[PDB]
Design a protein around this nucleic acid. Structure first.
Length: 1088
RNA sequence: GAUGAGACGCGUUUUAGAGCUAGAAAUAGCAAGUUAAAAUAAGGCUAGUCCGUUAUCAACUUGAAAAAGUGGCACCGAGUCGGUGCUU
DNA sequence: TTGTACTGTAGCG
DNA sequence: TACAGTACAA
């Protein structure tokens, strides 16, 4: 009557099995629908579900974010066009239209082919006068005469579109960029640090002595040569090296006294970077980025003509290969091909080594300066303030000439400078799953009127309530920051409570250790404890400490940070100010923009003010903690009256750890956790947590349990065995769904007992008693693993059977089911291919013909559709009937599901029989002659779908033949396995014949069969190890799935691809259930 | 560790940046090249500076959909399950 | 003009 | 690893 179900859940597989109380898997005659002759097939209640891995939403999030960025960039361009329209439309009637249709071929182009002027003479004059955009930018900055309005528009449109980063706040100044002033500040703070023997010095000429011309290690002698009173190994060399990112010997040169020197060295380093990002830097006043790129263009031109002359005169061989070929990573490949800067350097670098006199040019490669482009991967560090200043200079230079620039200077500057804040989110109207913003009005949001439309308080508060995460130990409670005061003091006390001294720590000792050392220094080591506390206070000469090895991993960074921003130390040591300080760290963790942070902290202005506020406004914290206030110093024990944290302060002689406070059942804390932890099936799965790779596994195993209950007359099991983010989720749902009855005195009736097991027990059961398994032979190991889970679980709850378990491990019929997916994702591969005459190119837009504009390729098929119809064939037309599959792609999926009939007559199929349209997803199973099974991978690709059910004794033979000397058991057992597997060595020559029969029956890969037979015969004499590993990889030939290229000793066998789905037109399609015990067999040969 | 927000720089694609000479030419020699526009999932309607690659999905009967319903047992054996016997 | 075989295709920090 | 591009059998 009663039965048990065993499960084994993985990321790609869910194994399931039914056992009785006699450890036997039942077999039942299952009814089969469809038009086939078969009405009932005998099936066993053991099998496994195979499925695709569940993906995280990350890639979707990146594509979403990028798509928003492109939309907003186009919107900025549209805003600038709207500003220009009223005047420039009088200047040039069709300028924006030409810039819009610049992409089109001339025959699609309604207006003239030249985008800017529309006349060839003025376009050539523009390109001669301004070969790059930077020349036009620099002229518009540096010219006082009346300029043409369209060129002004290209300048600001280039500047607004490609606007640079916002990693630096506020405005730029030479006080941060010019290295000399921060060097003066750094030497000033060093001198006030010691004042005995200072190196007093003026500013430094960093343009040679610290930037790329003598950067990194070279500055440690170049700058030292101007100040020989200090040295490269000295502390001045130390600060310069720290200003160059090196690791100097701080311990040899020498407390938070030196932290000022460290931070000033870091800001000096920042000054060198903002100097070196621009070539000209301080060498000229006008248009610094435009000037830098014009200089780069001039240097590129002269070095290019030098390089061409030198190649043409001294080594004319491969002159065409460099400058004409455009395929072998030459200069023509650098410009007209897809060769990077470093690839072009790497191509000509052995060349330049071979040629003579290249030294003056090769250093430009060694400095990465040679023939650089103006649009490069290195432009990512360009701040937006440079473009802002350039745009401001252009509008101030043309303010009086064009009045609408004077009326809209702040408008254009706001278009460039506006950033949607971290906390506002998307500017939706409720039609977004992600948006949380609250409007204070119902109108269009522009950057000019952003500050009077969004309710920043309500949007901010919603942002707090969404972004806050919730505690793993109690999911209803808000987490603290990882940089919270109580979080750091929690982990400091939790690390300190496991320290034992020999001459455990008591409460007063721990409190004094924290008050004299942890609340004084960032890093505390064992030597500091035994020297500054035990000898100083406890008067202990010799102390041995075993709790901590070298130093404490936890530290009070946040405490000393607050002690830095305000020096009112007793205020930090006051328990009344704890919640206020928690609110500040909650403020800086959540927000990154200065405005709303300023609004939140301004409430506390009546406690402290001025310099402390202006200082603390620059601090920011990142990350979030794993614990809540309501657990650390929250719930209280009934008998002791102490929390987690109160127990951490004092626990008598034996000190108890947070995990062991949870683990101990003698307190009410476990009860307090479990009574508060608890918080349609689709509605029930819609809220659960965990990684996507395992959530799929849980949902599919509960569905498998649903189908299994449906099979067995709705009778419940006696117990269900479950394998071990998911640590209670493994049981949670199935306890809730099986156990649905309760009484007034019994809180829950245990009709089904959910038994939890670890993989160590089942693996040890397998390793001890010769019931071995491998992954390469077949996917029967999942079902065998689950059935073994059921066996051991029932045996342990209860506590010829060995013959039964060996027979079940050697039963051939196991219901392997590959779950059938409609494919979802991007409908094509992302590389845009160039123009071609092929019709296979996918159009990138509705009006862009891919024969002229290129397009995408490799489309993805969501599912295939079997159609029977008449197709127009032949010059002398007649209507021939045909049955064939057609692959529906992801882009055509919706258009197919709106009206399948019209979509099929769009493709050439007429007189389509509508009722015989069958939907075939990926991994649709077809059966053919001699039991050959083929799996539909696409409309024009099949896959292997048959299992080689090799008897268990030979699988034992293969496992023992491998791992020949790495058992790590006992010598008697190891030598017994070796001699016992040597006594069966003829199993090798029988298993190769097993492979031959099964592959000749259902794989049909005869050339590959002869290849592996010849390679086996000519490698017969090699020993057990490497032979026994190569037969393991030959099961790739017989394994279900796509045909992969496996490899023998030396030869590599290419896969045999089944690129023909014509044979499944007459096969028997199997509609297999999630457990596969119910099937619907349709004989497609009777259709059409 | 799941999950979200805001940004930047590249890349790709088509076009614009007049190629010259010898040429019946299939072409040969030379010059030139660094930049810009437009798009970056086709598109969708509640038209938002929003959404569109995450999750979900055997077949049949009801139901717009949600969702519900849809398939006997015992024994002997085992090449992807077969056979024997009761039952409506 | 239609099927097969072999090799190459794939946008990130 | 599904699909593309080129190269042959009829």
């Amino acid at each position: 009557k009663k039965y048990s179900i065993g499960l084994d859940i993985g990321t790609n597989s869910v194994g399931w099995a039914v056992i009785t109380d006699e450890y036997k898997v039942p077999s039942k005659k299952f009814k089969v629908l469809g038009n086939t002759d078969r009405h009932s097939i005998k099936k066993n209640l053991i099998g496994a579900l195979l499925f695709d891995s569940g993906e995280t939403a990350e890639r979707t999030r990146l594509k979403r974010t990028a798509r928003r960025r492109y939309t907003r960039r186009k919107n900025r361009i549209c805003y600038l066009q709207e500003i220009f329209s009223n005047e420039m439309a009088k200047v040039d009637d069709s300028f924006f239209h030409r810039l819009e249709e610049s992409f089109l071929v001339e025959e699609d182009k309604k207006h003239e082919r030249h985008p800017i002027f529309g006349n060839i003479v003025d376009e050539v004059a523009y390109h001669e006068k301004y070969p790059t955009i930077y020349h036009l930018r620099k002229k518009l900055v540096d010219s006082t005469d009346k300029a043409d309005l369209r060129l002004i528009y290209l300048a600001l449109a280039h500047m607004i579109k490609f606007r640079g980063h916002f990693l630096i706040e506020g405005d730029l100044n030479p006080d941060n960029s010019d290295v000399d002033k921060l060097f003066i500040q750094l030497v000033q703070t060093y001198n006030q640090l010691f004042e005995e023997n200072p190196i007093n010095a003026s500013g430094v000429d960093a343009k040679a002595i610290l930037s790329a011309r003598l950067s990194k290690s070279r500055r440690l002698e170049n700058l030292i040569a101007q100040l020989p009173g200090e040295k490269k190994n000295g502390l001045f060399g130390n600060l310069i090296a720290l200003s160059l990112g090196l690791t100097p010997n701080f311990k040899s040169n020498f407390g938070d006294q030196y932290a000022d020197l460290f931070l000033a060295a870091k800001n000096l380093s920042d000054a060198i970077l903002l100097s070196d990002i621009l070539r000209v830097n301080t060498e000229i006043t006008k248009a610094p980025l435009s000037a830098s790129m014009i200089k780069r263009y001039d240097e590129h031109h002269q070095d290019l003509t030098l390089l061409k002359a030198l190649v043409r005169q001294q080594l004319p061989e491969k002159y065409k290969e460099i400058f004409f070929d455009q395929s072998k990573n030459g200069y023509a490949g650098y410009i007209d091909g897809g060769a990077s800067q470093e690839e072009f350097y790497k191509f000509i670098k052995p060349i330049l080594e071979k040629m003579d006199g290249t030294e003056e040019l090769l250093v430009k490669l060694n400095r990465e300066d040679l023939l650089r482009k103006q649009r490069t991967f290195d432009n990512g560090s360009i701040p937006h303030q440079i473009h802002l200043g350039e745009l401001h200079a252009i509008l101030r230079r043309q303010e009086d000439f064009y009045p609408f620039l004077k009326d809209n200077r702040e408008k254009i500057e706001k278009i460039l400078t506006f950033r949607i804040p971290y906390y506002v989110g998307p500017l939706a109207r409720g039609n977004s799953r992600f948006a949380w913003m609250t409007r204070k009005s119902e109108e269009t949001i522009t950057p000019w009127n952003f500050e009077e439309v969004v309710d920043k308080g309500a949007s901010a508060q919603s942002f707090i309530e969404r972004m806050t995460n919730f505690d793993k130990n109690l999911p209803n409670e808000k987490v603290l920051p990882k940089h919270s005061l109580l979080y750091e003091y929690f982990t400091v006390y939790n690390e300190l409570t496991k320290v034992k001294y020999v001459t455990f720590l008591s409460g007063e000792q721990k409190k004094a250790i924290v008050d004299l050392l942890f609340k004084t220094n960032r890093k505390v080591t064992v030597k500091q404890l035994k020297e500054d506390y035990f000898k100083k206070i406890e008067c202990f000469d010799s102390v041995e400490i075993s709790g901590v090895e070298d130093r404490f991993n936890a530290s009070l960074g946040t405490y000393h940070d607050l002690l830095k921003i305000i020096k009112d130390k007793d205020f930090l040591d006051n328990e009344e100010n704890e919640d206020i300080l928690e609110d500040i760290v909650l403020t800086l963790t959540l927000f990154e923009d200065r405005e709303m942070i300023e609004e939140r902290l301004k409430t506390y202005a009546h406690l402290f003010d001025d310099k402390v506020m202006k200082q603390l406004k620059r601090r920011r914290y990142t990350g979030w903690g794993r614990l809540s206030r309501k657990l650390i110093n929250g719930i209280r024990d009934k008998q002791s009256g102490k929390t987690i944290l109160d127990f951490l302060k004092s626990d008598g002689f034996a000190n108890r750890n947070f995990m062991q406070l949870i683990h101990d059942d003698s307190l009410t804390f476990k009860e307090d956790i479990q009574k508060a932890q608890v918080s349609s099936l689709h509605e029930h799965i819609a809220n659960l947590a965990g990684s996507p790779a395992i959530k799929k596994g849980i949902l599919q195993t509960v569905k498998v349990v649903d189908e299994l209950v449906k099979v067995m007359g709705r009778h419940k099991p006696e117990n269900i065995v479950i394998e071990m983010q998911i640590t209670k989720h493994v049981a949670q749902i199935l306890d809730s769904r099986m156990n649905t009855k309760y009484d007034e005195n019994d809180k829950l009736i245990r009709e089904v007992k959910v038994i939890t097991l670890k993989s160590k027990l089942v693996s040890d059961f397998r390793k001890d008693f010769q019931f071995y398994k491998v992954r390469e032979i077949n996917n029967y190991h999942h079902a065998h693993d689950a059935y073994l889970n059921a066996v051991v679980g029932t045996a342990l709850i209860k506590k010829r059977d060995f013959a039964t378990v060996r027979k079940v491990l050697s039963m051939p019929q196991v219901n392997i089911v590959k779950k059938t997916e409609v494919q979802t994702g991007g409908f094509s591969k992302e590389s845009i291919r160039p123009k071609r005459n092929s019709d296979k190119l996918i159009a990138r837009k509705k009006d862009w013909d891919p024969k002229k504009y290129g397009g995408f390729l490799w489309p993805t098929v969501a599912y295939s559709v079997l159609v029977v119809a008449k197709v127009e064939k032949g010059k002398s037309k007649k209507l021939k009937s045909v049955k064939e599959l057609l692959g529906i792609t992801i882009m055509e999926r919706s258009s197919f599901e709106k009206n399948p009939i019209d979509f099929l007559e769009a493709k050439g199929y007429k007189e389509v029989k509508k009722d015989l349209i069958i939907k075939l997803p990926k991994y649709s199973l077809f059966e053919l002659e001699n039991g050959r099974k083929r799996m539909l991978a696409s409309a024009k690709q099949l896959q292997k779908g048959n299992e080689l059910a090799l008897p268990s004794k030979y699988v034992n033979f293969l496992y023992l033949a491998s791992h020949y000397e790495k058992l790590k058991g006992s010598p008697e057992d190891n030598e017994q396995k070796q001699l016992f597997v040597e006594q069966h060595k003829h199993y090798l020559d029988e298993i190769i014949e097993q492979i031959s029969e099964f592959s000749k029956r259902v794989i049909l890969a005869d050339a590959n069969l002869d290849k592996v037979l010849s390679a086996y015969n000519k490698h017969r004499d090699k020993p057990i190890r490497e032979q026994a590993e190569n037969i393991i990889h030959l099961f790739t030939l017989t394994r279900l799935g796509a045909p992969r290229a496996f490899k023998y000793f030396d030869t590599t066998i290419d896969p045999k691809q089944y690129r023909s789905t014509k044979e499944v037109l007459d096969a028997t399609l199997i509609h297999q259930s999630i457990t596969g015990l119910y099937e619907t067999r349709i004989d497609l040969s009777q259709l059409g």
